[PDB]
Design a protein around this ligand. Sequence first.
Ligand SMILES: CCCCCCCCCCCCC/C=C\[C@H](O)[C@H](N)CO
Ligand SMILES: CCCCCCCCCCCCC/C=C\[C@H](O)[C@H](N)CO
Lengths: 49, 39, 39, 238, 238, 298, 298, 99
Amino acid sequence: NLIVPKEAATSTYIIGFAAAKNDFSLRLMRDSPDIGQSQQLEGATAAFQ
Amino acid sequence: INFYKDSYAASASKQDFSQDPSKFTEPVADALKAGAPVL
Amino acid sequence: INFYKDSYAASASKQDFSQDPSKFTEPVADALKAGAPVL
Amino acid sequence: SDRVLQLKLGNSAIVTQEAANMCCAYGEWPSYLPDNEATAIDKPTQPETSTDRFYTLKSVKWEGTSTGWWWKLPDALNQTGMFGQNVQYHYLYRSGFLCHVQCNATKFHQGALLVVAIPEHQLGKYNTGTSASFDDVMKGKTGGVFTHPYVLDDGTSLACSLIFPHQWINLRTNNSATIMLPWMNCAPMDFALRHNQWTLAIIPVVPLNTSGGTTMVPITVSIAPMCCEFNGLRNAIT
Amino acid sequence: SDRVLQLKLGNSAIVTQEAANMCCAYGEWPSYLPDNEATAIDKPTQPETSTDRFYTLKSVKWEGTSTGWWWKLPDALNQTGMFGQNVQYHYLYRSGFLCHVQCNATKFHQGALLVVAIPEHQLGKYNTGTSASFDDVMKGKTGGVFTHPYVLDDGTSLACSLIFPHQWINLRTNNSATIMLPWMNCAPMDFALRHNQWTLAIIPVVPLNTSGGTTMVPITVSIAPMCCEFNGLRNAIT
Amino acid sequence: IEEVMKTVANTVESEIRAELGVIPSLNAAETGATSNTTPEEAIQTRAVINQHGTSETLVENFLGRAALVMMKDFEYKNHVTGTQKVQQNFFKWTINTRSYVQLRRKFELFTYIRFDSEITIVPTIRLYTSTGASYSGLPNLTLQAMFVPVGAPTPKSQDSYEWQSACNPSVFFKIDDPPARMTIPFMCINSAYGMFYDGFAGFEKTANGLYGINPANTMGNLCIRVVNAYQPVQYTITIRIYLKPKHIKAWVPRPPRTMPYMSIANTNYTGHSSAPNNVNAIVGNRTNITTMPNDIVT
Amino acid sequence: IEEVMKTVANTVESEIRAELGVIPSLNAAETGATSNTTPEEAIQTRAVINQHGTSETLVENFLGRAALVMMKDFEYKNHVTGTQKVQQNFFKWTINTRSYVQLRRKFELFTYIRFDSEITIVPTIRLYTSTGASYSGLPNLTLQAMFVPVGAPTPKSQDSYEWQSACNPSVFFKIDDPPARMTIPFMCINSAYGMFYDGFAGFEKTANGLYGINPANTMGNLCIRVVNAYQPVQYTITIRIYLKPKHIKAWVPRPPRTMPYMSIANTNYTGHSSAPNNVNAIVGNRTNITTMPNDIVT
Amino acid sequence: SMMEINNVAGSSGMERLRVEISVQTDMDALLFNIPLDIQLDGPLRSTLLANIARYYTHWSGSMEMTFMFCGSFMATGKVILCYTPPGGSCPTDRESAML
Ligand SMILES: CCCCCCCCCCCCC/C=C\[C@H](O)[C@H](N)CO
Ligand SMILES: CCCCCCCCCCCCC/C=C\[C@H](O)[C@H](N)CO
């Protein structure tokens, strides 16, 4: 369980972290789905004037 | 094949297999051992 | 002629004349002789 | 000398006095996975005498109208013994197999069986576009029967299937067939519940003729896993 | 240095930061049966990473009126994991055990537990002539509770039970206890379903006092079989 | 054993044989072994120094030939007109090697093949025939073929922003140039490609839909577009992809396919309505087992 | 230390451990060090000789790929008609590498990068669709791309006299040729390019307008024109510039960008209206912390 | 790097990076679970691991998850963190999970 004294808070937090280890490897580089464009950015077309 | 005078014209140099995961994973003053209690 | 860095880019390797017809034609535990009665 | 044969594995043994020979597939012998080729890093379990032993399936009755029979070779054992239990508790499996087929008759009976082990026998369906269902292929220890053995239910041919490791059971000469199968896979190990490495097929190429003798002629299949090992222990799922 | 301890077995590991020490029963370590002492001649199966690993039982709630708890030490695992399956498929069993007991509290809680492993704890009954029934003793993974812990339910005494391998869990000092048990038997091996070599007993000699803090204080038992081997493979019986 | 065979075997001389206990021409097919009876012990042979080579029939030379793997046409116009708000001057293809039976049957002679793929892209162009179909020549358009691995975003328009391809490899090639060519490595997650998969691609036990689908045969997508903006006239672009394998290694030979293929996802069969290549009759029929169909009339 | 790693680490065998005072799986994240617990001391491992290479993921190979850096179209006609007295068959671009997010996010994984730039210019051409839009093929026009450093005069017309380029480097390339290619050196005034600048580009303390503008990122202008005089018909020229870095050196890795970009001059963020990639919720929502969204139904 | 284990509606900003552990009134209780996926949207998708890995298609090798307790000094507890190899459903009881 979580056991706490009478005067201590009964709720606490965990932080979780993750990582690779020294045997980890990646192959076949692609484009990440984490970003994308829909329109020209602000000032993008201003660079031509 | 590089027939240009300027060395920066050459192909890519994709050959540097040295690594140092320790500047990021263990950047501490006192080296941590294995199995020994950290602090 | 291969001027690419990756060895898989090379031409075909049509040069391996070794053969072993025996994994398919005689894949038995006891080797069969010639002229001797099989079983 | 090569007509008698005794196979011993764990607490099980089989003798035969009219064997033809022993077929070792592709001139190979089962062995454990070397460290050179392994990928899963956890320590494997290698039960030897509790898994590497003969399991005798139910017999099938050879009739005059029989088309043939097949067993998906891990799938046929997944529900059987300590092998099945290890298969259920572990994510990853690897083994060879030693397949022995028994069918005895008299000197007046006649007929021939093709005992052929087909690696990665992806089953086809006749006259339909939809693929085979889970039930059509995951028949378990019961096995299936061929619909069109002449094309191996695969659009290939029976005639060329002799390229695969095989033996015959010609009733005038021999009453048993034995084939030893190594690990067939691209991968070092596999999930035993969703992929079959081998199919043992029994096909009556020459039809049985009793000629007044005993009519109930059964075919019996005994399979022993070889060099079993398992990885990724967890809870049991069936 | 001796207050922190990590135990690793197969795919399971346990850490503790307030251990007292480790208790190795009678200065002994589990080991496989040597050929010098064996009697069954068939080749044993020795699953290592699938059986020699920690199994965490259900927790028990420590109350102010608690008398104590016990687990019959093979019997508690006979229905659990690959150990249980091997126990079911084999006539003969042998192992040690590594028993770890977890009970954590605060610096304001108080109480003491006697974690004692009793070899061949033949259970007695109070105020009756008839012996204990099968249900009274074969409690499985649930374990039992002591009726009269002061006589160990055995007409002996709790006070002298410190002759057996034991550890304490004093809430002001430590929150875990670990005892490692070798094979205790006259015989080289035994039928795991009708004889228990060890009883792990948890007895609250000093009663728990919450003193305004958290009231639900559970005790958790994790046991790992050590050097398991099995003989006499057959069908599974439960 | 293993022997190096640049040529085929010679024939040696043979002589009259009349021995007791020696039966070279007698075998036992039940053992699973092919007959070892050689011509010199079947008949009285002469010597023949035989210099017939075996190089043409090597597996590397048997499979190492470019064959059609994909072919697809699409319209090059302005599709924004109407109710369509997307330019759509492109197409997407999920890479498979089971679409065209010629290459497919040659690959399915083995269970596992490991090879690098030499890819050649052959574009053709025509001018659409409709009303004002006054020919004016074929424009020299530049095309972009982008490889899109599993999990990468896929373009939805000709003017999508997935076409920058910061990480996805692309080739820009023109109509009038030589065909585009690049090598894909052996890119399986296993040691070899499986031509056949006797299993399911999902951990979940669905009733149907996943038999024979190999989890490792998920090579991804090929997207090809026209870089140029639309012209006032419509053209039809046809893209043909040729695959040549190289550095080939093949294991476990299999019976060749005899029934016509029906799908790219399964081995389903129906055959023809009558022999040859029928589910009951692979070889054509002769009148009886005593009839030569092509007999010399002497 | 520094180790050369052609492959990844092997796994060694491991055995039962029950030691006092040894706690490999216990760490302290407050020190700022990542856990050093290895698999062999977490679980009982087998030996594995591991031959998985690490070359594909080198920084040189991670960044050394051509990506779109600029794309711009302009009209090729006679603009002198009307009230415009300047030919204007050209355009000017102020060089930046923050216009297209695919390359930008890959660069902003580091604070400083030193590289030479391999520049590839890909021209496309179309025929404008208006009235007499009778197709007659795409002309083989020659284009001039002139690099204009800071402080050099900049062309104001197609027929300006800045196009002699006695000192400014120029490339003359035709539509039907292969794309033009040249290497720009590492041309920063500092030892490396800064992807981020936490400061101001002016000595004067203006209220706003100069935060995040790096003084060294003033690479100058690229001016591209059509050398040919105007044709009787109007064409649209589209110029795409691809940048490939090479000889790359990267320092100080940074958290990847998660919010969509909004400008090329600042790191301003707004996110999406709902998860994923929202200012309050980068990862999408599940029902609760006890819910697998993709759970095998056994 | 931190995992958004608490990626639920209602949790905004930093609330997503931390998991509340509180005094239970039921033993053997399930606290949370983490979907071990990198391509799909999940707790791993916030890590630097998953942000570099998603630039590639294939991966191999062991990972690690580190958990940190940020309660008071006087709070004690014991938790078991179990990894289950694939093949079946997620364990919902501790007796099935500890296997
Ligand atoms: C710079 C790359 C852009 C062009 C990319 C072209 C991709 C086209 C590939 C078509 C054929 C790929 C074949 C790959 C694998 C094997 O053949 C299959 N798994 C069959 O086993
Ligand atoms: C003969 C030269 C004529 C063509 C000149 C082409 C110039 C186009 C250059 C575009 C990209 C230049 C990138 C230069 C520097 C760095 O990438 C930026 N400072 C970003 O840090």
